[PDB]
């Protein structure tokens, strides 16, 4: 029985190592993300801690709706428009901070 259980233990070890590596990379990226907003964006505008209690789906959906509106809003300023359009790439998030 114990050996059977240690099998699951080893499986869980592998899983935990994977999760550990993922969180390590996440923190590494978030460091630079923060150091962009660290320039006086964090306080009351870009960080909004009341939103801490919702999930990625809702946040992304409302973000997309906001962008659908804002792009029309930023129709004027070509470089600001370019920042918006480029940061539209979800894979490269801190762009949206710079925008």
């Amino acid at each position: 029985e114990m050996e059977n259980v240690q099998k699951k233990l080893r499986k869980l070890e592998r899983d935990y190592y994977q999760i550990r590596e993922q969180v390590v990379s996440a923190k590494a990226g978030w460091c630079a993300v923060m150091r962009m907003v660290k320039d006086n964006g964090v306080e009351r505008r870009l960080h909004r801690r009341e939103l801490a209690y919702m999930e990625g789906g809702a946040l992304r959906s409302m973000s997309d709706k906001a962008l659908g509106a804002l792009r029309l809003a930023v129709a004027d300023n070509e470089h600001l428009r370019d920042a918006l359009r480029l940061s539209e790439d979800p894979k490269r998030p801190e762009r949206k901070v710079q925008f």
């Binding site: 550990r20 969180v23 390590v24 923190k27 460091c31």
Partner: protein, 72 residues
Amino acid sequence: TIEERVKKIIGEQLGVKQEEVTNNASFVEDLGADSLDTVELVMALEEEFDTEIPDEEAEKITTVQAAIDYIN
């Protein structure tokens, strides 16, 4: 080397400069690593040397000097 891998890991897990991170640079004060930051720092340190640390032994570490000491 280990004594510089430690600084690399600490820096890119806290964003602190290589210069700020001396052996005595305490994470919570000198490097401003808070609860979750400290946990993530120990996590990344464990990853760097693919080794695990006991919970109380891990939390005992609170300074670059102690971190290297346990690591080496």
